[PDB]
Amino acid sequence: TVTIRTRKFMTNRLLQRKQMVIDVLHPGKATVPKTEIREKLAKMYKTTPDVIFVFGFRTHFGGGKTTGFGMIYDSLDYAKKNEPKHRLARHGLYEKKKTSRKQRKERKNRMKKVRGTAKANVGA
Amino acid sequence: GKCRGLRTARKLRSHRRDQKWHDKQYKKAHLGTALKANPFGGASHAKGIVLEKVGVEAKQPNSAIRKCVRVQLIKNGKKITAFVPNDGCLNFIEENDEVLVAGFGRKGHAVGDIPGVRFKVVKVANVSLLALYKGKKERPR
Amino acid sequence: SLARVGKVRGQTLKVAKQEKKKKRTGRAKRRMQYNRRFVNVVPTFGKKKGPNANS
Amino acid sequence: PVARSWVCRKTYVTPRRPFEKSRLDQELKLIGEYGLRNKREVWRVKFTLAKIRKAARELLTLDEKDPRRLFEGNALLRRLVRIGVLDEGKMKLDYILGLKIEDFLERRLQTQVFKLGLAKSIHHARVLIRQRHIRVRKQVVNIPSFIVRLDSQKHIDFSLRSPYGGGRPGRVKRKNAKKGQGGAG
RNA sequence: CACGGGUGACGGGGAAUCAGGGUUCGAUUCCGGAGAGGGAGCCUGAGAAACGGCUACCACAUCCAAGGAAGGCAGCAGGCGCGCAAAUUACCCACUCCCGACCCGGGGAGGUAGUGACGAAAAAUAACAAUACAGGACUCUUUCGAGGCCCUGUAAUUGGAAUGAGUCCACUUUAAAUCCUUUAACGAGGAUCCAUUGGAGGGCAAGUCUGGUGCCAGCAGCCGCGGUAAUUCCAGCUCCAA
Ligand SMILES: [Mg+2]
Ligand SMILES: [Mg+2]
Ligand SMILES: [Mg+2]
Ligand SMILES: [Mg+2]
Ligand SMILES: [Mg+2]
Ligand SMILES: [Mg+2]
Ligand SMILES: [Mg+2]
Ligand SMILES: [Mg+2]
Ligand SMILES: [Mg+2]
Ligand SMILES: [Mg+2]
Ligand SMILES: [Mg+2]
Ligand SMILES: [Mg+2]
Ligand SMILES: [Mg+2]
Ligand SMILES: [Mg+2]
Ligand SMILES: [Mg+2]
Ligand SMILES: [Mg+2]
Ligand SMILES: [Mg+2]
Ligand SMILES: [Mg+2]
């Protein structure tokens, strides 16, 4: 009962992708997840769901319509070439480091104090 | 206007600029003598330390004993006969306490039965006299 | 003298507040106000009595 | 320097005299007639009426065959026709001054639901608006201040997610059915 | 109207009140100016008399083995003091851009969250049906009374019907979260899931009600009220303004 339509279709050869605004109609249930969005776009466009990246859903009032954006790359190599690392880490092919920002600033200001090769020996 | 020439702008402007100073509100607002004589110093509220409680006799026909407080300010050190507004609220005010002092709504003027009192008390030791009168809060002891 | 502070407030009789059905509020209060003003009463001769008028 | 609007405007203006008996009489009759929530609901429609009448006076003070006057007059007549207070044959900038708070309150969605008759009373219509039983062009309206356009007047009906419409029953009906089945066995 | 003085005066676009005219404010996110406790001087560099650059003096202040060394939060958070008066010692470069040898790094600029009743916009705290009653356009009846095609309101009388506020799995949101919207399951009859703030002599809407006080307490922005029957105090009820 979930229906996906596409608006504002555009082909970016300079980004090697497709792009459209996704309109999801889901009467009788909640907001459907992005995995089901990628699966239904995959069975719509006859491609693998690995290259389909969908983000940014906003649900209208009343509860029968959402608005979201999505892009469909040519390959995963092109997706890793021009796709943000945080939206790659949303799905899990990329994993960012866990070094916290204030501790990185403190380590940088500690390495600023000591001159020489011992800048590496200051950190741990 | 009296001089109705086509180029009497400086005459009309200088005459009005001279005659604005004879207005009571304009001269009080634009001279620093009233702001110096004001104990608040261009302020709406002021905290001050209680030192004694005064029973002020009333004016003509209305005859009563109003209850005032000799408040010494913090920002200037000036002394104010501040007024205790509600009934039975002098007992809440003890000696050597910080109380909040506001006006009475006539913009620095003695009001009604009370001679020589311009200001009143709002809060008593960070506890409001309105809540002390209504019975909502308690004096911190 | 300052000995008579709170005299009448001390010596009045402490009357307890009567328990009462809670009043309707907002649009329902203004609707009930309109109903008790206009649609209930009729135009009568003489001077019309006030809302809180009693005898 | 932060990136935000800081643009706001008071939609209502309080009157100059607070305790006019005739003014309170008129506003009380308006609230009791069209089912309003407070005096601010009168005052904001009065202030929008003041805006429209001030624009109308500013157009009538302009000269005839002025391009700004003709453009703003045609635009304001188009706005009055599309909100449906002024008639499509009556549209002339001299007739804007003869317009009234009652005809502005006639286009309230609460009043339009009451005139279409799907609700019993005006405040019952306001209860339906608050409880989200009605929709306008497949869009649920929760707020009774919806200025219904003349083009979108005929599309007012019950919403799909509503027990008064074609949907699931409410909490009271479900609880009564569950208690009945529990008492039966 | 020079010069001098004061400014509780950075200037402007602009803000409020506004008929038409004016009056007051503008430190405040945009443009330009000035400054980094007070002045003064200089290196580097295209661009500084730069202060998260130095060099001296004054005020303040740290360590010392008493020879000496080091400082500038009117940056972001936060602490003291001053006050009538004003927020978290948070998360992140993902949005906007800036800089660098630069697609990769950095940014307390900035973005997002925590406090927030400065303020602005929308806006819950009930509605319906049935009984008793109190009445209005008809018919009938001299009035009293009666039938309901039409009604309107009231009463801790009864009845189910509908929903949030909250609780809470799950998506969505987001750099990662939070909130909004969606969505199962709970969740309302004194729907105790209880709306207050001021007043009731006049101005100014709204009791010559009841009890106490007796020019005392107090009320009162103005006139005035209280001197033992207070429409003005203190309490209850009722009503009025939002
Ligand atoms: Mg007198
Ligand atoms: Mg100066
Ligand atoms: Mg200055
Ligand atoms: Mg300025
Ligand atoms: Mg400088
Ligand atoms: Mg400083
Ligand atoms: Mg310098
Ligand atoms: Mg600094
Ligand atoms: Mg700097
Ligand atoms: Mg404040
Ligand atoms: Mg960035
Ligand atoms: Mg980068
Ligand atoms: Mg900042
Ligand atoms: Mg409530
Ligand atoms: Mg009273
Ligand atoms: Mg009065
Ligand atoms: Mg009156
Ligand atoms: Mg009075």
From Swiss-Prot, chain B:
The modification N6-acetyllysine is found at residue 134. It holds the Pfam family Ribosom_S12_S23. Keywords: Acetylation, Cytoplasm, Endoplasmic reticulum, Hydroxylation, Isopeptide bond, Nucleus, Ribonucleoprotein, Ribosomal protein, Ubl conjugation. Belongs to the universal ribosomal protein uS12 family. It comes from Oryctolagus cuniculus. The lineage of its organism: Eukaryota, Metazoa, Chordata, Craniata, Vertebrata. It is found in: Cytoplasm, Cytosol; Cytoplasm; Rough endoplasmic reticulum; Nucleus, Nucleolus. Residues 1-19 have a biased composition (Basic residues). Residues 1-25 are annotated as: Disordered. The modification 3-hydroxyproline is found at residue 61. Signal peptide: none annotated. This is Small ribosomal subunit protein uS12. Hydroxylation at Pro-61 affects translation termination efficiency. NCBIfam families: PRK04211.1, uS12_E_A. GO terms for biological process: translation. The modification N6-succinyllysine is found at residue 53. GO terms for molecular function: structural constituent of ribosome. CDD domains: Ribosomal_S23.
Curated annotation (Swiss-Prot), chain C:
Coiled coil: none annotated. Signal peptide: none annotated. The modification N6-succinyllysine is found at residue 47. It is found in: Cytoplasm; Nucleus. Component of the 40S subunit of the ribosome. Contributes to the assembly and function of 40S ribosomal subunits. Component of the 40S subunit of the ribosome. This is Small ribosomal subunit protein eS30. The lineage of its organism: Eukaryota, Metazoa, Chordata, Craniata, Vertebrata. The gene is FAU. The chain holds residues 79 to 133 of 133 of the full protein.
UniProtKB/Swiss-Prot annotation, chain D:
Component of the small ribosomal subunit. The ribosome is a large ribonucleoprotein complex responsible for the synthesis of proteins in the cell. Part of the small subunit (SSU) processome, first precursor of the small eukaryotic ribosomal subunit. During the assembly of the SSU processome in the nucleolus, many ribosome biogenesis factors, an RNA chaperone and ribosomal proteins associate with the nascent pre-rRNA and work in concert to generate RNA folding, modifications, rearrangements and cleavage as well as targeted degradation of pre-ribosomal RNA by the RNA exosome. The gene is RPS9. The modification N6-acetyllysine is found at residues 65, 115, 154. The lineage of its organism: Eukaryota, Metazoa, Chordata, Craniata, Vertebrata. Belongs to the universal ribosomal protein uS4 family. There is a cross-link at residues 92, 138 (Glycyl lysine isopeptide (Lys-Gly) (interchain with G-Cter in SUMO2)). The modification Phosphoserine is found at residues 152, 162. It comes from the Eukaryota. PROSITE patterns: RIBOSOMAL_S4 (PS00632), S4 (PS50889). Keywords: Acetylation, Cytoplasm, Isopeptide bond, Nucleus, Phosphoprotein, Ribonucleoprotein, Ribosomal protein, RNA-binding, rRNA-binding, Ubl conjugation. GO terms for molecular function: rRNA binding; structural constituent of ribosome. It comes from Oryctolagus cuniculus (Rabbit). Residues 161-185 are annotated as: Disordered. This is Small ribosomal subunit protein uS4. Its main location: cytoplasm. Residues 107-181 form the S4 RNA-binding domain. The keyword Oxidoreductase does not apply. One of its GO terms (cellular component) is cytosolic ribosome. Pfam families: Ribosomal_S4, S4. NCBIfam families: PRK04051.1 (NF003139), uS4_arch (TIGR01018). It is found in: Cytoplasm; Nucleus, Nucleolus. Gene3D superfamilies: RNA-binding S4 domain (3.10.290.10). One of its GO terms (biological process) is ribosomal small subunit biogenesis.
